[PDB]
Protein backbone atom coordinates (compact mmCIF):
# COMPACT_ATOMS: atom_id res chain seq x y z
CA UNK A 1 0.00 0.00 0.00
CA UNK A 2 1.29 3.45 0.94
CA UNK A 3 4.66 4.31 2.50
CA UNK A 4 6.51 7.16 4.22
CA UNK A 5 9.76 8.93 3.42
CA UNK A 6 12.54 7.95 5.89
CA UNK A 7 14.29 11.24 5.26
CA UNK A 8 11.27 13.54 5.65
CA UNK A 9 11.59 16.90 7.48
CA UNK B 1 18.96 -7.64 -11.82
CA UNK B 2 19.71 -5.60 -8.67
CA UNK B 3 19.12 -1.87 -8.35
CA UNK B 4 22.32 -0.92 -6.54
CA UNK B 5 22.91 2.48 -4.97
CA UNK B 6 25.15 3.28 -7.92
CA UNK B 7 22.50 2.35 -10.47
CA UNK B 8 19.91 4.34 -8.54
CA UNK B 9 22.24 7.34 -8.25
CA UNK B 10 22.87 7.35 -11.98
CA UNK B 11 19.12 7.08 -12.59
CA UNK B 12 17.99 10.00 -10.42
CA UNK B 13 21.06 12.16 -11.04
CA UNK B 14 20.42 15.42 -12.87
CA UNK B 15 17.20 15.44 -14.86
CA UNK B 16 16.45 11.96 -13.57
CA UNK B 17 13.40 10.12 -14.90
CA UNK B 18 10.30 11.69 -16.42
CA UNK B 19 6.64 10.57 -16.72
CA UNK B 20 3.67 11.87 -18.70
CA UNK B 21 0.60 12.47 -16.56
CA UNK B 22 -2.20 14.81 -15.51
CA UNK B 23 -2.75 16.79 -12.33
CA UNK B 24 -5.96 15.54 -10.73
CA UNK B 25 -5.77 18.17 -8.04
CA UNK B 26 -4.30 19.58 -4.85
CA UNK B 27 -5.82 19.34 -1.39
CA UNK B 28 -4.83 20.64 2.03
CA UNK B 29 -4.33 17.73 4.39
CA UNK B 30 -4.16 17.47 8.23
CA UNK B 31 -1.19 15.09 8.51
CA UNK B 32 2.05 13.97 6.88
CA UNK B 33 1.01 10.35 6.45
CA UNK B 34 -2.00 8.08 6.15
CA UNK B 35 -3.63 5.67 3.74
CA UNK B 36 -7.17 6.60 4.75
CA UNK B 37 -6.38 10.31 4.78
CA UNK B 38 -4.81 10.00 1.34
CA UNK B 39 -7.73 8.01 0.00
CA UNK B 40 -10.25 10.60 1.18
CA UNK B 41 -8.34 13.35 -0.65
CA UNK B 42 -7.90 11.36 -3.84
CA UNK B 43 -11.62 10.54 -3.79
CA UNK B 44 -12.66 14.16 -3.21
CA UNK B 45 -10.29 15.38 -5.92
CA UNK B 46 -11.44 12.76 -8.43
CA UNK B 47 -14.98 13.75 -7.59
CA UNK B 48 -14.15 17.35 -8.39
CA UNK B 49 -12.22 16.52 -11.57
CA UNK B 50 -15.24 14.52 -12.72
CA UNK B 51 -17.65 17.42 -12.22
CA UNK B 52 -15.23 19.50 -14.23
CA UNK B 53 -15.01 16.96 -17.01
CA UNK B 54 -18.79 16.91 -17.37
CA UNK B 55 -18.41 20.59 -18.27
CA UNK B 56 -15.60 20.28 -20.78
CA UNK B 57 -12.84 20.94 -18.26
CA UNK B 58 -9.85 18.61 -18.35
CA UNK B 59 -7.00 18.02 -15.91
CA UNK B 60 -3.80 19.93 -16.63
CA UNK B 61 -1.47 17.84 -18.81
CA UNK B 62 1.90 17.57 -17.05
CA UNK B 63 5.30 15.94 -16.71
CA UNK B 64 6.16 14.35 -13.39
CA UNK B 65 9.92 14.63 -13.19
CA UNK B 66 11.66 12.51 -10.54
CA UNK B 67 15.26 13.17 -9.50
CA UNK B 68 17.57 13.80 -6.55
CA UNK B 69 15.97 17.25 -6.55
CA UNK B 70 12.73 15.56 -5.62
CA UNK B 71 9.58 15.97 -7.69
CA UNK B 72 8.96 18.59 -10.36
CA UNK B 73 5.48 19.08 -11.76
CA UNK B 74 5.92 20.60 -15.21
CA UNK B 75 3.26 21.87 -17.60
CA UNK B 76 3.40 19.80 -20.77
CA UNK B 77 2.47 22.74 -22.99
CA UNK B 78 4.64 25.58 -21.70
CA UNK B 79 7.40 23.66 -19.97
CA UNK B 80 6.87 25.90 -16.96
CA UNK B 81 7.84 24.31 -13.65
CA UNK B 82 4.59 24.54 -11.68
CA UNK B 83 5.83 22.87 -8.51
CA UNK B 84 9.04 21.51 -7.05
CA UNK B 85 9.19 19.46 -3.89
CA UNK B 86 12.58 18.48 -2.42
CA UNK B 87 12.86 14.87 -1.25
CA UNK B 88 13.04 16.04 2.37
CA UNK B 89 9.62 17.67 1.99
CA UNK B 90 7.72 14.66 0.64
CA UNK B 91 6.53 12.73 3.68
CA UNK B 92 4.21 10.12 2.24
CA UNK B 93 3.63 8.44 -1.07
CA UNK B 94 0.06 7.22 -1.43
CA UNK B 95 -0.87 4.27 -3.58
CA UNK B 96 -4.41 4.48 -5.02
CA UNK B 97 -5.85 0.97 -4.76
CA UNK B 98 -8.88 1.96 -6.84
CA UNK B 99 -6.82 3.02 -9.87
CA UNK B 100 -3.87 1.47 -11.72
CA UNK B 101 -3.19 4.85 -13.32
CA UNK B 102 -3.28 7.14 -10.29
CA UNK B 103 -1.27 7.83 -7.14
CA UNK B 104 -0.54 10.74 -4.85
CA UNK B 105 1.97 12.10 -2.38
CA UNK B 106 1.92 14.38 0.64
CA UNK B 107 4.40 17.22 0.91
CA UNK B 108 5.16 20.37 2.85
CA UNK B 109 6.57 21.15 6.26
CA UNK B 110 4.96 20.01 9.50
CA UNK B 111 1.48 21.48 9.92
CA UNK B 112 1.30 22.53 6.27
CA UNK B 113 0.70 19.28 4.39
CA UNK B 114 -0.71 19.04 0.88
CA UNK B 115 -1.84 16.03 -1.13
CA UNK B 116 -0.98 16.05 -4.82
CA UNK B 117 -3.18 13.62 -6.73
CA UNK B 118 -1.78 12.41 -10.02
CA UNK B 119 -3.22 10.58 -13.01
CA UNK B 120 -0.43 8.76 -14.83
CA UNK B 121 -0.48 8.50 -18.60
CA UNK B 122 0.67 4.90 -18.21
CA UNK B 123 0.72 2.62 -15.17
CA UNK B 124 1.28 4.33 -11.83
CA UNK B 125 3.21 1.53 -10.12
CA UNK B 126 6.54 1.98 -11.97
CA UNK B 127 6.32 5.61 -10.87
CA UNK B 128 5.52 4.79 -7.23
CA UNK B 129 8.44 2.36 -7.24
CA UNK B 130 10.84 4.97 -8.58
CA UNK B 131 9.85 7.32 -5.78
CA UNK B 132 10.39 4.54 -3.27
CA UNK B 133 13.84 3.78 -4.64
CA UNK B 134 14.67 7.49 -4.73
CA UNK B 135 13.85 7.91 -1.04
CA UNK B 136 15.81 4.74 -0.44
CA UNK B 137 18.95 5.93 -2.21
CA UNK B 138 18.95 9.39 -0.66
CA UNK B 139 18.68 7.55 2.64
CA UNK B 140 21.51 5.04 2.03
CA UNK B 141 23.98 7.70 0.93
CA UNK B 142 23.28 9.90 3.96
CA UNK B 143 23.65 6.90 6.28
CA UNK B 144 27.08 5.94 4.91
CA UNK B 145 28.38 9.52 5.06
CA UNK B 146 27.33 9.51 8.72
CA UNK B 147 29.13 6.27 9.55
CA UNK B 148 32.15 7.89 7.88
CA UNK B 149 32.07 11.10 9.94
CA UNK B 150 31.84 8.91 13.06
| HEC-encoded secondary structure of chain B | CCCCHHHHHHHHCCCCEEEEEEEEEEEEECCCCCHHHHHHHHHHHHHHHHHHHCCCCCCEEEEEEEECCEEEEEECCCCCEEEEECHHHEEEEEECCCCCCEEEEEECCCCCEEEEEEEECCCCHHHHHHHHHHHHHHHHHHHHHHHHHC
The residues, any chain, with a CB within 8 Å of residue B37's CB and separated by 6 or more, are: B29, B30, B31, B115
DSSP class of A9: -
Structure determined via: X-ray
Among B69, B91, B127, B129, most A C-beta atoms within 10 A, so best to mutate, is B91
- Provide the resolution (angstroms): 2.5
Whole-Å CA distances, B87 to A4, A6, A8, B53, B56: 11, 10, 7, 32, 35
**CB-defined contacts A:B, below 8 A:** 45
Query: Domains of chain B: which residue ranges?
Result: 1-150
Does A8 contact B95 at a Cβ distance shorter than 8 Å? no
Q: What is the CA radius of gyration of chain B?
A: 16
Fold of B1-150: PH-domain like (2.30.29)
Chain A residues touching residue B135 (CB < 8 angstroms): 5-7
| Minimum distance, in Å, between the CA of residue B128 and any CA atom of chain A | 9
Q: Would you give the DSSP letter of residue A7?
A: T
Amino acid sequence: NGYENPTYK
Amino acid sequence: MEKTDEYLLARFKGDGVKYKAKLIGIDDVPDARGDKMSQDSMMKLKGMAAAGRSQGQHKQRIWVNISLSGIKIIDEKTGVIEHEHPVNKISFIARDVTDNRAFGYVCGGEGQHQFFAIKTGQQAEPLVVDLKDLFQVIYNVKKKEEDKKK
